Design a protein around this ligand. Structure first.
Ligand SMILES: Cc1cc2nc3c(=O)[nH]c(=O)nc-3n(C[C@H](O)[C@H](O)[C@H](O)COP(=O)(O)OP(=O)(O)OC[C@H]3O[C@@H](n4cnc5c(N)ncnc54)[C@H](O)[C@@H]3O)c2cc1C
Ligand SMILES: Cc1cc2nc3c(=O)[nH]c(=O)nc-3n(C[C@H](O)[C@H](O)[C@H](O)COP(=O)(O)OP(=O)(O)OC[C@H]3O[C@@H](n4cnc5c(N)ncnc54)[C@H](O)[C@@H]3O)c2cc1C
Lengths: 645, 645
């Protein structure tokens, strides 16, 4: 018999925090049903370079995000906006969840997004303590080596932002209003004082800096290691090697390899939970007080439908045997970030000397900065607070080498064989597309549910007058407009790059190859000759302009639109699957029953401003507080860390 | 049952002093866990000549520093700076510790080193009483026989120091600023008043003298004996032949043959200690008040890691079962002295008459003086107080016969078969290299832990501009620069030797053979033609001088650098393994718990100016005071000695 009252389902980035601190300051019984094992000895997972295939045997050079021993492999339905191609994205399969197989970034999400996007009691001032706690527990590290590329970028940014402060435009992309009127770009000289983008009081929404924060820890020996949720919260110091708590944590049980099917359910008080061991046997943990769901964005709603709470007509049509509650918002409104790709060529006598120290390393991992921007001026879909508050919209990145897939490499002909390349990425942060998740089999936890996520749907003109069908075209074309404005943003930095590199004693030439520059200069001409109505030319049938200028600009837009659909990566940064206000209240509690609550990244009512690791950790901390009834994690001193072994 | 509250681990040079005086002025219970036996009857250890193999049977002529019946035999990891060769150095194994197998020298360490190198409460004025006490307890003896070699050396030194006083240079190597501006060189005639380098008020940092102080005592019969920590503090007069105290010392127990594994540990108050008898049985001494660690530089940190206090991640990775405190400075920062070697040849009608009375004896033991010097003028790594205070840097020595290993003897072809040789040694005293100690087996006291100690690492030029990579080359090349300047110092005395020997009615010729003189005269020419920037030519790739002069000088440096790596001895004078400020406070107390303190030579935050025997004795005396709470050893009259039997 396996009676319990604390029942966590999944040791993700939020499961570990919740379980660790809940067991630290409470003496209930805790079972953590995890379905993965602890890769404490696997050299590929500990060494960060193993992320880049140092240990793969020659036959099978793949990344852990694809390997089925490491990650769940859902396959999404075809994307009607990207030529009906189906993507595979990964939830982790290990203690610590996705953190075991991630890229280790720590962007906390600025003041603006939570203050004006999150409900009462979750404002930036109400949770920033939790964020301090988690960034303290990890204690990530930066790189401190010089690279002339980042300096070039940041001085070009200063050049351009000085024009932007003048001319009085209130929402241009290099503007910050917490710093008076000017974002604090990091200085450019030996040992300049650093800019920390994750500042405690969220001063910097827009800024420029020079390296990122990754979850490594330099060891005394000289080798760097992965530092993740399983590594910190649940290691040999607290949990027995068989899955039992140690001393102070004695009421803490970890069933490592256990997939939960559903939560058996009585009255409206869920009473029991079923799991399947590796040896094939069902068991049942009895539930006395509560159950916890921390099983990722994708699988959490599936757990809920199989449990019994969800849309009755659909679930009955597929044939789940038990119905509990009719909540037709279960698992709705998924979101994610997106990232197109852009290349540059270099042509000069000493360009090889201009790009040294750009190889990925154990501290940088193929990152060289290099900024974070806001809305472009000519963006039409901005919130009403754009004028008085600055928003985090574009997440600039930079890397050496080639990032485009080998097919695009064949098409453009630009290969890493000819060494003149580096990539700039504008990771959209406020991406619009919204999708939903269902199940197709009421049987067991699969590896692929129904996932619909359509991105770049083009507009179909109708016979309605243009005067009331522009404001549906706008909202349909939103992602295209945002991606194109990001293209403009990257395009209009490269010339300041040319200037500052020529003037810093470097004789090289910079010209974008993918996408080809000529398209972009034509776009710039069209933009600054057509004004805010530049986006009216996505649908040439509505403008009714036969002048060759507008015809050529619309043609340019048309041929350009191929590249965000083709040359991009889909971000793993899923979120927002069981949002507050949709299926749960501000207490994370599930609406319709009394003893089930969801406490993971699915509950976020809005996607945060960065790589969505820290937000889920925060949610775990806060949910610990909510179940506890009193704030202790908020009141713990910042400099107490869990032990590291 | 073996309950205790005073628990000393190891009867070293500091264990004996501590135990003896602690039991003299206190009435607690004292157990001294020693792991060795008392060589009171062994003729080889009592007779000082036995150090030089008078009693070895013909099959096994070895020295006690190698014999495993006498000394622990750690083997260091390969020295990357000396052609990856691994050294073996000895900690003693007997009551009295290393003193039983040592070379018997008494350099106390001058005013400068403790006053500006040791923390508050340990200044020279605050401890000099303890040093007086210990040098009084031993009462070493000198030689009083004439030898023309030492007179030659000292008059040459006078000659050169008179030039050095003029020319106004403030940090040249034959300068003393406590004696106005001139070191007090010992006179040269019959029965001249002696210069005692271990003066009570530390007037002489730099000086010249004519014989050393050794731990013998002339007996009434006519035979000299070893006089050491076990001999003085713990002999038949105070301790029973079974290991029990006598009368006044009745609360004093000596378990002679007992190796301590770890200190069993409760809460944060260590409670018990385990040892292994010769007959194979574990026992346990209960600890009521404190435990004492006096088990040498090497083994003390090992005791600490096996006990439980140390770096958690490393110790957990190797698998010690218990963790107590996370102090990642345990056993860091080892230091030691170093000693290259140099030969001279003599060619003249009466040279045999010039070197009589240089055979080692029971009072000299192969020493014939002969000085102690400070920084050379052109040394770049000097402390900021070099100008206003004189520092002890080079420990000159001299001996008859050949000192180079038989392989070097084959290579140079100079053997003691042709009788024209004596050696000059410049024992570096402020040597830079720093290493660290770990353990590899959490099982029992081994004979060899992980020891890393890299000395002569050469610089690897990079693509950084020279203007900011000279001050990393300097600090990397420091030991090379110091050794080379010592070579210059010895080289530029031999010509004054030629002069004073020719002018004192002796017709002989002096010329260095190993290293060959021609290298050294080329070095002198390069030094005085290149100035302080003579060391820029270690890395010829940075100077960018193609003039044959600089090319030849850099070549000379390159070929010379072979000899300090090859023809030298490693000093046994380990120190500084658990320094004050690193793992203990000014009370010697270990940081993290309440009842364990380290009181041996590992705690020294800086290496003293001489053969590191007297310093550990001082530390024992002071720690007696610290545990006592009142100064009595400081207040004992100087002329009370413990009884000698
Ligand atoms: C390729 C990749 C790159 C990434 N890059 C970054 C980056 O640059 N920066 C960054 O900050 N983050 C990065 N991440 C991490 C990611 O952005 C978040 O850290 C992730 O959303 C963590 O959320 P979570 O822990 O709540 O969800 P999850 O980690 O998905 O939690 C789900 C957990 O529950 C377990 N589970 C699922 N179903 C069951 C079941 N039925 N029974 C029992 N257990 C179950 C799973 O095994 C898993 O351990 C990356 C991730 C990936 C895969
Ligand atoms: C070859 C040689 C030449 C020397 N020459 C000179 C010289 O010219 N001048 C000079 O002044 N000094 C000389 N010395 C001595 C040396 O410089 C110092 O005297 C030495 O550092 C004394 O320090 P210590 O007594 O604190 O350490 P140690 O003597 O090393 O103390 C360690 C003691 O603890 C014991 N012990 C270790 N582990 C355990 C355990 N687990 N359980 C119980 N007991 C244990 C050991 O048996 C030993 O008795 C020489 C030494 C050697 C070996």
């Amino acid at each position: 018999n396996l009676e319990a009252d604390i029942v966590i389902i999944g040791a993700g980035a939020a499961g570990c925090v919740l379980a660790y601190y809940l067991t630290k300051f409470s003496d209930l019984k805790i079972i953590l049903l995890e379905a993965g094992h602890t890769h404490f000895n696997d050299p590929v997972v500990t060494d960060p370079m193993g992320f880049f295939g140092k240990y793969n045997p020659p036959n099978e050079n793949i990344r852990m995000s694809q390997n089925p021993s490491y990650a769940w492999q859902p396959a999404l339905e075809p994307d009607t906006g990207a030529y009906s191609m189906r993507n595979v994205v990964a939830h982790g399969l290990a203690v610590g969840g996705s953190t075991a197989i991630n890229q280790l970034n720590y962007i906390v999400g600025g003041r603006t997004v939570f203050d004006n996007d999150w409900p009462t009691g979750w404002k930036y001032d109400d949770i920033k303590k939790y964020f301090r706690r988690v960034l303290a527990d990890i204690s990530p590290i930066r790189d401190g080596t010089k690279v002339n590329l980042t300096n070039t970028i940041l001085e070009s940014m200063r050049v351009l932002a000085d024009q932007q402060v003048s001319s009085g435009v209130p929402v241009d992309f290099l503007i910050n209003k917490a710093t008076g009127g000017l974002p604090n770009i990091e200085q450019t000289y030996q040992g300049a004082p650093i800019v920390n983008l994750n500042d405690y009081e969220g001063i910097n929404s827009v800024c420029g800096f020079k390296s990122y924060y990754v979850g490594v820890n330099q060891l005394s020996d000289g080798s760097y290691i992965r530092k993740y949720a399983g590594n910190t919260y649940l290691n040999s110091y607290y949990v027995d090697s068989n899955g039992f708590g140690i001393g102070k944590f004695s009421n803490l049980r970890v069933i490592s390899d256990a997939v939960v099917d559903r939560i058996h359910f009585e009255g409206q008080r869920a009473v029991s939970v079923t799991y399947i061991d590796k040896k094939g046997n069902l068991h049942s943990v009895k539930v006395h007080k509560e159950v916890e769901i921390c099983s990722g964005s994708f699988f959490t709603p599936t757990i809920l439908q199989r449990s019994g709470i969800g849309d009755f007509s659909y679930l009955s049509s597929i044939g789940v045997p038990d119905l509990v509650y009719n909540n037709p918002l279960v698992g709705q409104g998924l979101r994610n970030h997106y990232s197109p790709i852009t290349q540059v060529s270099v042509t000069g006598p000493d360009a090889a000397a201009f790009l040294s120290n750009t190889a990925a390393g154990p501290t940088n991992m193929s990152f060289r900065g290099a900024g974070m921007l806001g809305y472009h001026k000519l963006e039409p879909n901005k919130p009403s607070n754009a004028g008085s508050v600055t928003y985090r919209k574009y997440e600039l990145l930079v890397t050496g080498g080639v990032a485009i897939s080998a097919d695009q490499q064949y098409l453009s002909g630009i290969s890493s064989s000819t060494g003149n390349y580096f990539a700039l990425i504008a990771d959209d942060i406020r991406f619009a597309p919204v999708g939903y998740i269902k199940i197709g089999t009421p049987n067991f936890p699969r590896d692929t549910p129904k996932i619909f996520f359509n991105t770049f749907v083009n507009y179909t003109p109708t016979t309605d007058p243009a005067d009331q069908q522009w404001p549906v075209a706008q909202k349909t074309l939103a992602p295209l407009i945002s991606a194109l404005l990001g293209y403009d943003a990257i395009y209009q930095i490269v010339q300041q790059m040319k200037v500052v590199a020529v003037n810093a004693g470097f004789n090289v030439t910079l010209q974008m190859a993918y996408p080809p520059n000529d398209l972009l200069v034509e776009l710039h001409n069209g933009l600054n000759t057509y004004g805010i109505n530049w986006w009216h030319y996505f649908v040439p049938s509505l403008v009714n302009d036969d002048t060759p200028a507008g015809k050529l600009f619309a043609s340019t837009l048309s041929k350009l639109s191929y590249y965000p659909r083709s040359g991009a990566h889909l971000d793993s940064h899923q979120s927002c699957s069981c949002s507050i206000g949709g299926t749960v209240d501000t207490e994370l509690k599930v609406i319709g029953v009394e003893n089930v609550r969801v406490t993971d990244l699915s509950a976020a009512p809005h996607p945060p401003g960065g790589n969505t690791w820290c937000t889920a950790a925060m949610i775990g901390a806060r949910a610990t507080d909510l179940i506890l009834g009193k704030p202790l994690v908020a009141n713990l001193p910042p400099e107490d860390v869990p032990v590291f072994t």
